[PDB]
Every structure is written in C-alpha cells, then in structure tokens.
C-alpha cells in the first residue's frame, strides 16, 4: 500500500505573470510569486496553491499553509495525492493533499531533520554536515503510507 512519489519540477509558466508550476499526466500544480524583486524564488509563502485534476477536470485551491518549497512538490504515481514540503522559520512539515479536493490527507512534523523523497520513499536524517540527507550520520526510512492513503 506504499505508493510512489515523484518530484514535480516547478518552473516559470507562460501567460499570467509571476506564475510557477508544473504538471504530469494527472495533475497540474501552480503557485504565484509575489516577491516584487526576485524572479527566481526558491519558495512560495502566499496561498493559494492551484491544483488541476486533469482526469476529473476539477480545479481546486489550497487556501492556507506554506511556506511551500519550490523544490519540494511530489506527485503520487496514481495522481491522487500531492505531497508538499512546507516550512516556517526553523520548523518544517510534509503535507499530503487529495488532488481532487485540495483537502489535507496527512501531516508529519519533520522539524530539525534533513529529508528526501524519491522512488524509494521518504528518508529522514540526523547528525548532518549539511542540508542533503546524504550528509547525515544516520538516515532513517519513514513510512509514506499515511500520505498515500492508497
């Protein structure tokens, strides 16, 4: 029941100004960049996040949360879940959303931990040289099951 998440690249979009997003077969994610003097942000503090469920056709807005890391958006293979890294100050959490409704499925507080998500799952690290989880003395696998709710 352990679904697989894949990184979604978030890039400047054509059309409406200051929009950043990406899509795969199942879902399109869009953010607004409201930093007046930074055209290449690494994060998005202002909601809403726009989700388009390509299959059903529904568009919804995540109206609260953040700050959303630009490099921290992942899609489940079936398109039903969007996993997002969100931070505030020195705290951080991973949040899973239902792509059809924009409702929160699961949160996990990962404050203080280095982290990575890929084909193989979620890793959390302690005693680290730097930001990458591979710089850590100890890396633990963390279940993604509650995020998938497969």
């Amino acid at each position: 029941a352990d679904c697989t998440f894949t990184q979604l690249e978030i890039v400047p979009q054509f059309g409406s100004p200051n929009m950043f997003g990406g899509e795969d077969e199942h879902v399109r994610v869009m953010f607004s960049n409201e930093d007046p003097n930074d055209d290449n942000p690494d994060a998005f503090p202002e909601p809403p996040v726009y989700l388009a469920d390509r299959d059903s056709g529904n568009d919804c807005r995540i109206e609260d949360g953040g700050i959303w890391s630009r490099g921290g958006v992942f899609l489940s293979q079936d398109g039903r879940r969007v996993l997002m890294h969100e931070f505030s100050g020195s705290s951080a959490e991973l949040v899973s959303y239902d792509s059809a409704t924009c409702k929160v499925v699961h949160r996990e507080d990962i404050s203080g931990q280095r982290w990575a998500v890929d084909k193989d799952g979620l890793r959390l690290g302690q005693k680290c040289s730097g930001e990458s989880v591979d710089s850590c003395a100890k890396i633990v696998k963390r279940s993604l099951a509650p995020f998938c709710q497969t």
Binding site: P45, S91, S111
Partner: protein, 146 residues
Amino acid sequence: SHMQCIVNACKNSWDKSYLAGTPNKDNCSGFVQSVAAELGVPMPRGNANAMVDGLEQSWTKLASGAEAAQKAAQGFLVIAGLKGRTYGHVAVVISGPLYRQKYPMCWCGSIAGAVGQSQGLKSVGQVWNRTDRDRLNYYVYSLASC
C-alpha cells in the same frame, strides 16, 4: 559614522560556526549568537526557544515589524523571534522595504534548509509562514550598536 554595524555583523557572522561543528547558516540561534558577540550585545544562552524565553523576560518589545525596521536603521540590534514546538526561530531584523507593507527584511540561518535562510534578501514574512509571521515578537536591545 556609518550606520551599517548590524549588517556588517550579519555578513561577518554568516560563515562562522557559533556551535562547534555546526555552520551558522544551518542554525538560527548560532547565527544570532555570533552577531551579538561581534556587537558585544549580551544574549541569552541556549537554543532558539531558550533564547526567545530569555528575550521575552528581559528585552523591550516593539509594537510592529515597521518599528523593528526603523530601529535597525537607527543601529539597534532587533531580534525577530517565535518559539516552536521544539525548534524555534530567531532572525536579525535589518533596514529595508517592508514585504507586503508589514514585514521587515532580515538575516537568519535555518535548519529547515536554504529556503529558510536569509542573507538579507528575504523578509521575516518570507521565512515564517502566513500564520506565524503575524505572531512574531520583535525584541530590541536597550542600547544601539552604532
């Protein structure tokens, strides 16, 4: 004399490790400790939560982010601070335009990653999220540094 004592201290402090083995860019409390040490401003010991506890017990609080920026422009060390469940956050407020006409520019390290770090180019409202940024405390030292 110039009024860049705060900014100079932030720049000089960025690449230091206040805590042995922990770069200040990755440790908000360490970065603030290094800045204060350079300015010779006494600072509560401990992690970010312990520092906020200490500042809350001793330093004057400013009414707004706008006032924080003005005080920083006047050469005062101003710490924006908010406790976390375990990992709190502290940042040095600097002079500059207010993000969303409210939130002052800042410097800070952050264990959250590069996204939470500011070398003066992010406001407190771009390091803390939309709810937390409206809960910030702005502590100002009793004396100016330049």
